[PDB]
C-alpha cells in the first residue's frame, strides 16, 4: 500500500553502534566518564532512566491498559460534539424509536390557544430578536457565538414572563454543564450517551405521557429502516475505558428530579465548526434518550422491561435563526431485541424564526431599499417554543 | 529611488544573523570568533 509517513520527517533511527560493541568480552572506552561528548571515543549506551521518585508533571503518560477502568469490550460513546453520518436514521436505529413529523396534539392545542399568549407577543419577540442580533453588543455585527445564547435566554425570559398568569413554573430550575451517562446494550453493541449539554431545565413534577395507547400498539408494527453499507456506530467514539453506571447530572435526593427541556446551541462562527440540522437532530435525540434512560433507571430499576408509565422529555436546538423542536417519549428499556415495543418521537424540524437580519441599512442607488431589522418573521416557531415551555403546566 | 537607508534595524534579525549562537553554530563562525579574539576585539559579536 501507500504508507502515510515520510522518512524525512519521521523520527530518525538511532545511529549504528560503534564497532567496539560487537567484540565479545571487550569493554568499550566512551566519553561517559567526562560527562560530555568528545570525538574519538565510542558512543556510550545508557539504560532507561528510572526516576525513583515519581513527579506528576514530568512523568510519562501511563498506558491505557494500566487504568483500573480499562475493559476489553469497546464501548461506543456519544459525547456532545459527535457527528452522525445518517443523523436521524442512525439515531432512530440506535434509540429504537418511531419518528413523527408534527408536534404532539396537546402541544398544538396549547400553542394555538390565544389565551396562553403574551401581552404584546409580536412586539416583544421582535424586540428580543433585534436585541440579540444587533443591540446586545457594542460591535456592529455580533458573532453567532455571542447572539445564540443571548437569543435563547431572551426567549427563555419571554416564556418566564408568563409565570404571573401560570403560578406553576416555579417548580423548575436551570442547570449548566452537568455530566450525563446512560449506557445500554442494543443488538450486542454497547452504546453509551456520555457527556454534557448546553442547558438543562429540571422540575419537581414529571411530564405526563403524550402518546396514546393506540399509537403505542401501532408502534409494534413499525420496523426500523436499515442501512447495510454503514454500521450503526458511525461517528461514535470507540473507547476502551468507561463505567457501566447510570450517572445523571444530579445526586440522590434532588428536589427537581424530572428533566423537562434540554437546550442545545450551535454557537460557532464557522459553518464547518457548526452542526448540520440532521446531525443536530440526532444529537438531541440521543441526549434526550440518555436523560430519559437515567430517569427511568433511577425510578424503576436497571432491569430491561417495558415502562407502564412512559418518560417524556423535550429538547430545543438553536442555530441562531433556525429552531428544531423535539418531544421524545421513552416507553421501553429492553433494546437488545428489536421485536419489542419501540419508543416514540415527535421531531419538528427546519423552523425559521426569521429569514434574514440586516444589521446595517443597505443602500442601493443612493436610496435605502431595506431598513434595519429582521426581514420575514414566523411567530409560529415562537408559539411552539412557548408550548414546549408551558407543557408542564 | 532614494538610497542610503538600506539598514532597517531589527534586533531579532541582528541576533539571528550576527549573534553569538549563530556564530558558534558553524565552524566558520568559530574561526571568525578566534580571529577577533586574536586581534583583541572588545566585542566579539552582537
Amino acid at each position: 500500500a501507500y504508507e502515510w509517513g515520510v522518512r524525512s520527517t519521521r523520527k530518525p533511527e538511532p545511529p549504528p553502534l560503534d564497532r567496539v560493541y560487537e567484540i565479545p568480552g571487550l569493554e568499550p572506552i566512551t566519553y561517559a566518564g567526562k560527562m560530555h561528548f568528545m570525538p574519538g571515543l565510542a558512543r556510550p549506551v545508557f539504560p532507561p532512566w528510572d526516576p525513583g521518585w515519581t513527579h506528576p508533571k514530568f512523568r510519562r503518560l501511563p498506558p491505557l491498559h494500566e487504568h483500573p477502568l480499562y475493559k476489553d469490550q469497546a464501548c461506543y460513546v456519544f459525547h456532545q460534539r459527535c457527528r452522525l453520518l445518517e443523523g436521524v436514521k442512525q439515531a432512530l436505529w440506535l434509540t429504537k424509536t418511531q419518528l413523527i413529523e408534527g408536534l404532539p396534539e396537546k402541544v398544538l392545542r396549547l400553542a394555538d390557544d390565544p389565551r396562553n399568549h403574551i401581552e404584546n407577543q409580536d412586539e416583544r419577540v421582535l424586540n428580543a430578536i433585534s436585541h440579540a442580533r444587533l443591540w446586545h453588543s457594542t460591535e456592529d455585527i455580533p458573532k453567532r457565538e455571542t447572539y445564540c445564547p443571548v437569543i435563547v435566554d431572551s426567549l427563555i425570559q419571554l416564556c418566564k414572563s408568563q409565570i404571573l398568569k401560570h403560578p406553576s413554573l416555579a417548580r423548575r430550575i436551570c442547570a449548566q454543564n452537568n455530566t450525563l451517562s446512560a449506557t445500554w446494550n442494543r443488538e450486542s453493541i454497547l452504546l453509551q450517551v456520555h457527556g454534557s449539554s448546553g442547558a438543562r431545565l429540571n422540575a419537581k413534577d414529571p411530564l405526563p405521557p403524550v402518546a396514546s395507547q393506540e399509537e403505542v400498539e401501532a408502534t409494534k408494527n413499525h420496523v426500523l429502516e436499515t442501512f447495510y453499507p454503514i454500521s450503526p456506530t458511525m461517528g461514535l467514539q470507540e473507547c476502551n475505558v468507561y463505567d457501566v453506571n447510570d450517572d445523571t447530572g444530579f445526586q440522590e435526593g434532588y428536589p427537581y428530579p424530572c428533566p423537562h427541556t434540554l437546550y442545545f446551541l450551535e454557537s460557532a462562527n464557522l459553518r464547518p465548526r457548526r452542526f448540520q440540522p440532521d446531525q443536530l437532530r440526532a444529537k438531541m435525540i440521543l441526549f434526550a434518550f440518555g436523560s430519559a434512560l437515567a430517569q427511568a433507571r433511577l425510578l424503576y430499576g436497571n432491569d430491561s422491561k417495558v415502562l407502564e408509565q412512559p418518560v417524556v422529555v423535550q429538547s430545543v436546538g438553536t442555530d441562531g435563526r433556525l429552531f428544531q423542536f423535539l418531544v421524545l417519549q421513552l416507553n421501553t428499556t429492553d433494546l437488545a431485541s428489536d421485536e419489542g415495543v419501540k419508543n416514540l418521537a415527535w421531531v419538528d424540524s427546519d423552523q425559521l424564526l426569521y429569514q434574514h437580519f440586516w444589521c446595517l441599512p443597505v443602500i442601493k442607488k443612493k436610496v435605502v431599499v431595506e431598513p434595519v431589522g429582521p426581514i420575514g418573521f414566523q411567530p409560529e416557531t415562537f408559539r411552539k417554543f412557548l408550548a414546549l415551555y408551558l407543557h408542564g403546566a | 529611488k532614494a538610497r542610503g537607508n538600506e539598514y532597517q534595524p531589527s534586533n531579532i534579525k541582528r541576533k539571528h544573523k550576527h549573534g553569538w549562537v549563530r556564530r558558534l553554530r558553524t565552524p566558520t563562525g568559530v574561526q571568525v570568533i578566534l580571529r577577533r579574539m586574536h586581534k583583541g576585539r572588545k566585542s566579539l559579536s552582537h
Partner: protein, 240 residues
C-alpha cells in the same frame, strides 16, 4: 538551512489537512522546478488509492460501501468522492457518473465467470471482461494505484494470457501486470477538463504558475516533429 516537509501525518484523516506549498524549492532552498509558486491557499484531502482495504482482518471478503458526496479537490484535476463503509470513511477518486447516494462494491475474488462491471466496482483485472475501460490500475498486487488518475483519462484492458493482464494506458503504451491487481472500471470524473479555457493570465497565477522566462532560446535539434515507433510493452510480472 534545511526545511522540513509538511507531509508529517501517519494517521488517515477524512478532513482536509492544511499543506505548505513550496515553489520549485528542494530541501536546500534552491530552485529545482521553474514556474511554480505564489498559488492560492489549499488544503490536502487524503486519498486512499488502495481501493480494496477491509476494515478488520477478521473478514477479508469483498465489501460494499456507499457514496456520500462528490466534491471538488484542488490538488488534482479529478473530482473526489467521500465513501463510507463499515466504521470508517475515506476519500476515493470518483469516476465519470458517480453521484451522491450510490453503491460501490470492492472485491478481490477471481472466478471462471467475468463479473458484470458497473462503474463503481473495483475488481481485479482477472475478473473483468476482455475489453473494458478501467482506471486507477495497479502495478503489483497490494502496492496501490499509482497509475491512471487524471480527469477524463482511462485505460483499456486488452487481453489476459497465462494468468497475466495486459492493459493500454492513455499514452497508447501497453502495460503487463498480474491479473490479481485491483482496478476500477470506468472513466475518471470531470471529463471536460481538457475542454476548459483559461480566461486570462491571472487564472494561471491563481493555479500557481509563474510566467516563463523572457530569454529567447534558439531551437536545437530536439525541436521538430519526431515520429517514433511505439515503445515496447512495459512488463512488471517477474518471470522466474
Amino acid at each position: 538551512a534545511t526545511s522540513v516537509s509538511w507531509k508529517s501525518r501517519t494517521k488517515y484523516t477524512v478532513m482536509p489537512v492544511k499543506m505548505r506549498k513550496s515553489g520549485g524549492r528542494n530541501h536546500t532552498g534552491q530552485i529545482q522546478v521553474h514556474g511554480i509558486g505564489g498559488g492560492h491557499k489549499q488544503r490536502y484531502r487524503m486519498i486512499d488509492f488502495l481501493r480494496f482495504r477491509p476494515e478488520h482482518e477478521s473478514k477479508p471478503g469483498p465489501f460494499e460501501e456507499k457514496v456520500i458526496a462528490v466534491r471538488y479537490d484542488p490538488c488534482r484535476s479529478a473530482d473526489i468522492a467521500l465513501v463510507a463503509g463499515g466504521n470508517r470513511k475515506r476519500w476515493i477518486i470518483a469516476t465519470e457518473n458517480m453521484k451522491a447516494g450510490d453503491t460501490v462494491l470492492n472485491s478481490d475474488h477471481i472466478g471462471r465467470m467475468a463479473v458484470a462491471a458497473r462503474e463503481g466496482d473495483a475488481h481485479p483485472l482477472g475478473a473483468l471482461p476482455v475489453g473494458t475501460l478501467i482506471n486507477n490500475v495497479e502495478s503489483e498486487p497490494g502496492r496501490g494505484a499509482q497509475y491512471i488518475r487524471a480527469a477524463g483519462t482511462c485505460g483499456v484492458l486488452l487481453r489476459k494470457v497465462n494468468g497475466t493482464a495486459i492493459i493500454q494506458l492513455p499514452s497508447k503504451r501497453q502495460m503487463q501486470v498480474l491479473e490479481t491487481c485491483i482496478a476500477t472500471v470506468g472513466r475518471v470524473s470531470n471529463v471536460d477538463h481538457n475542454k476548459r479555457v483559461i480566461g486570462k493570465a491571472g487564472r494561471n497565477r491563481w493555479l500557481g504558475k509563474r510566467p516563463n522566462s523572457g530569454l529567447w532560446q534558439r531551437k536545437g535539434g530536439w525541436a521538430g516533429r519526431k515520429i517514433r515507433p511505439l515503445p515496447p510493452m512495459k512488463s512488471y510480472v517477474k518471470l522466474p
